[PDB]
């Protein structure tokens, strides 16, 4: 029998949606050597060329559904034994400039998950890969030139007997997409920063370790006669001075058998190494299980007298500046009956009732 | 004047162009790409540009999507020449695109000996829910060019671009820019 | 049409093409393929390869036995 | 985040469902010649041969799902001026044996 | 294909036209909308066929056999109708556009939509001539108009 | 001065004039037609002419029935005259009608040398419910030109003419308009 074509439902513009296995639209395999370093590109493709060459249940809907208002899931099921570990970091930025940086400091911003293959078995997390508004599609990310990233920012601690593989699983799930914009506001409830306060190696022994990490953030982090920038490191540095109850996300980076323990506390750059009464300020110890890897230190607003500077000239030496630190510091010692470093990551991830004061004129370099 | 009016606010200094050197007369041209702090001269004239690294300009080279009002202040000096022999003009052009079809969204000409100031602004405004992502494909999206026009070299020495963010303006989203070298102002003895 | 079958098809076109005939083409990509069940499947492909660096569009007819390592360019042209 | 993937809903047994877009799984061409007579074979080929170099939103779905509990709604858009006519047949055999007769009839 | 970029004119020599409204709308940079087209036949009842709309990107080449993968709305004229509205809602635009696009622009790096018209069959007929069909976007529901636009000078994309 | 006001907006530059060349040192104007797009130079005198093609001038070259302000801004250029050998000057004239008895609306009187640059506005408002067809002879409506003197054309080189509607602009109507030709800005090098 006939039917009028005109009116079937044939300009459904519905997104994508289901179960997870009937929004997977791509797996990416990627390859981690035997013996990979730290600031280590494995995978670097524009988020599109990542569905080239599939044929799961979603890749055709996924590439010529309109509008998609669903997130996108990805989930990395990578593993390895408790013995060893390393930290894998997949990063989605909005674009790229020619010959750039894959640091892991120039990468984090925007939207990433870090893990550790020894702990976490696998690891998934949501984004937009539009950032300013409720949707997107597939056609958007294309001619955009969104970019996956994968990033190894510590090598393994002890190496397995062959090459590993991390399958990556991007689905859609149907999460809200909501925008993360950044505004000039003074005063802002919660200003997300995922800026990479640094990879603490602390080595194998007994002696007084201690690293200090400047919260002084603003203006970018070193290189050569250069220096590197996220957009919201950037955008903090608008700013002249700042304060916020501060939300850093430490990270273990080694294996669960390279075990210390880590006293975290705000203070200031005149205090010297070989200083032995550090827990006469307030502190925060953090001893990793074999299973946690993940662990947030929160500093309260009592932590803090004023606002402090968000750049300082770079040749002030500890001696004199008056801006807080972020001292990380060994309890005990690092101690393991294999060989290898604690690695620890420490990362801002974002600063809670934010008070910005000032205009920056500005400084030109990095480190303090 | 003879009163002027009243400057308020932090504007910083992003790029600067100094003209080319002795014997070189003839009329020549420079553009500045404002939003993505780019200093192409016209033809193959040598130029003598710095692009600097205040906060606006790590955020405008670092910021995906952007929207909101931007102001500038394109500062003109200034060789020592007897004000009666001056005879050197600046055209000025905004443009949206570079391409020789796509017209100038504004014009502005000085012929101030000297010296000179031109304060202006200008509102990213894009597709995207109000922002715009300069020089993408996706919309045929396109930037902010400045291109500037020095009539007699020989008495223009340079421009300077100042910018600053009017409180409206708004970013989102990261770009992968490579290590900017650290070039700093050589402030005049 | 799975995209990722008929791309390692399009570069075996192109491949035995340059086996067959004693040419150097680089493939650059597939612009359209047609799969018809017959004693296998036939593939009809259009595709992108270079010739002395410059982009040209071919014709390809590929015969495949699904259940043998069997594949066959059967024909190969310019459009 | 980790989460426990062997209780996530990856064993869907679901059916293909949902809008005629979504639910299409391939598209065929006949050829009609000019002179065409009756009792001529147009089109023959196995219904699962239909699916082979398919790129539509169900052609996944169909492949893979190992059961489905609706029909296939086979639809045919050609037409011609009212000045003439024929008549076309499409038609689904459970099976064949060599050699085999397409009459009409049969 | 024909672009919705639509501002800027049709062409013609060295040289474009313009009605007002079309000029009207390049005022603006960027902008969207509920899409409202007007399809109509202009040969006789006996050249038949049938076509397919829909909205997508000039990357899409011909002898790309899945258009019907993108939401889409066939059309079939019968011998007494004559006139047939497509609509494309909000749904089917992720942003904005331009209005204007650069002459120069290739199908390849032009990534403002189009309206493709693809035959779903094949025209036919008994008599010989062309399968004509005009399309008229009488207006835009819900218009959001964006920015400034300075202008471009040309008009086909 | 020395300190600017603030300029913002997007002006699209709409028709420019060309003075004739050497030896040609005589007292000599030019007319735009703000409105129908048209450029008559006085007498015989060979000046160099284009009418350029952005969306403000489309619209005013199609639209029958208007309504509302536009803004000019009238650019003037500029030869390369050392400054105290200049005394050229530059009168314009707002009319309604090109007639000898219809009077001017507005005059502007500009000596400043090399370069120029004048703001001003005007309503264009009309009989059919605040609505003016520019020329119609219906109750004798009639447009708006923009006479423009170069007291010394070896020293001002062009003029230029860039608009804007405000906000508050209103047309209705189209009109049937010949093919317009592709006039492109030719940018100085």
């Not at chain 1, 791509?26 to 060329?49: H, I, N, P, W």
């Not at chain 1, 249940?57 to 509008?67: I, K, P, Q, S, Y």
């Not at chain 1, 929160?298 to 630190?325: H, I, K, M």
């Not at chain 2, 992502?133 to 291109?147: I, K, V």
Request: proline residues 6%; negative net charge; aromatic residues 12%.
């Amino acid at each position: 029998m006939e039917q009028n074509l005109f009116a079937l439902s044939l300009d459904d513009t519905s997104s994508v949606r289901g179960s997870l296995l009937d929004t997977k639209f791509a797996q990416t395999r990627v390859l981690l050597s035997k013996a990979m370093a730290g600031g280590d590109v494995l995978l670097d493709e524009y988020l599109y060329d990542v569905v080239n060459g599939q044929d799961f249940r979603a890749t055709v809907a996924f590439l010529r559904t309109h509008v998609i208002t669903g997130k996108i899931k990805v989930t990395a099921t990578t593993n390895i034994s408790d013995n060893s570990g390393c930290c894998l970091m997949l990063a989605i930025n909005s674009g790229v400039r020619g010959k750039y940086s894959t640091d892991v400091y120039t990468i984090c911003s925007q939207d990433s998950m870090t893990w550790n293959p020894g702990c976490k078995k696998n690891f998934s997390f949501t984004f937009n890969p539009n950032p300013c508004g409720d949707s997107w599609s597939a056609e958007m990310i294309s001619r955009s030139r969104v970019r996956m990233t994968v990033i190894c920012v510590s090598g393994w601690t002890l190496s397995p007997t062959t090459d590993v593989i991390a399958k990556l699983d991007w689905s859609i799930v149907n999460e809200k997409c909501e925008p993360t914009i950044y505004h000039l506001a003074d005063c802002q409830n919660w200003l997300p920063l995922n800026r990479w306060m640094g990879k603490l190696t602390f080595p194998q022994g007994v002696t007084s370790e201690v690293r200090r990490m400047p919260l002084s953030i603003g203006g970018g982090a070193g290189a050569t006669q250069a220096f590197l920038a996220n957009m919201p490191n950037s955008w903090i540095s608008m700013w002249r001075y700042f304060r916020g109850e501060l939300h850093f996300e430490v990270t273990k980076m080694s294996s669960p058998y390279i075990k210390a323990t880590v006293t975290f506390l705000i203070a200031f750059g005149n205090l010297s190494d070989a200083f032995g009464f550090y827990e006469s300020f307030p502190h925060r110890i953090v001893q990793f299980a074999e299973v946690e890897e993940k662990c947030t230190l929160v500093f309260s607003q009592q932590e803090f007298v004023t606002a402090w500077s968000t750049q300082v000239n770079p040749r002030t030496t500890l001696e004199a500046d008056g801006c807080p630190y972020l001292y990380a510091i060994i309890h005990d010692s690092t101690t393991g009956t294999i060989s290898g470093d604690f690695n620890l990551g420490v990362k801002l991830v974002g600063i809670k009732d934010f008070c910005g004061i000032g205009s920056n004129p500005g400084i030109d370099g990095s480190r303090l | 004047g003879p009163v002027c009016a009243e400057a308020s606010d932090v504007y910083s200094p992003c790029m600067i162009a100094s003209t080319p050197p002795a014997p070189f007369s003839d009329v020549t041209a420079v553009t500045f790409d404002l939003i993505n702090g780019k200093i192409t001269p016209v033809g193959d004239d040598n130029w003598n540009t710095h692009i600097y690294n205040p906060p606006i300009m790590n955020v405008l080279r670092t910021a995906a999507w952007k929207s909101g009002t931007i102001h500038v202040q394109l500062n003109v000096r200034g060789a020592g020449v007897k004000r009666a022999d001056w005879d050197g003009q600046v055209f000025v052009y905004l443009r949206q695109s570079m391409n020789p079809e796509s017209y100038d969204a504004r014009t502005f000409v000085i012929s101030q000996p000297g010296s000179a100031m031109l304060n202006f602004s200008f509102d990213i405004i894009g597709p995207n829910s109000g922002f715009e992502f300069a020089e993408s494909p996706w919309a045929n999206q396109t930037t902010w060019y400045l291109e500037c026009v020095a009539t007699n070299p020989r008495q223009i020495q340079q421009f300077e671009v100042n910018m600053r963010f009017d409180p409206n303006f708004r970013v989102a989203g990261n770009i992968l820019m490579p290590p900017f070298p650290l070039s700093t102002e050589t402030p005049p003895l | 049409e799975n995209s990722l079958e008929i791309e390692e098809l399009a570069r075996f076109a192109v491949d035995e093409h340059n086996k067959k005939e004693n040419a150097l083409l680089e493939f650059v990509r597939v612009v359209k393929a047609k799969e018809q069940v017959v004693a296998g499947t036939m593939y009809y492909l259009t595709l992108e390869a270079k010739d002395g660096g410059k982009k040209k569009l071919y014709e390809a007819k590929v015969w495949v036995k699904p259940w043998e390592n069997f594949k066959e360019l059967q024909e190969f042209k310019p459009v």
